[PDB]
Amino acid sequence: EKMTLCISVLLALTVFLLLISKIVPPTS
């Protein structure tokens, strides 16, 4: 992909946000 690295980064950012979010409330 011409932007495979970037999307992987926009998601690395979003996923990182998901986890930093999930950190407090896991089972929810």
Side-chain angles (χ1 to χ4, degrees):
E1 305 78 80
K2 54 178 178 177
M3 58 160 180
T4 191
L5 299 177
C6 310
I7 182 175
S8 182
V9 147
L10 62 83
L11 55 87
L13 296 161
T14 199
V15 172
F16 184 61
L17 297 158
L18 109 70
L19 45 90
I20 65 176
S21 292
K22 228 59 186 67
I23 300 282
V24 185
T27 56
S28 69

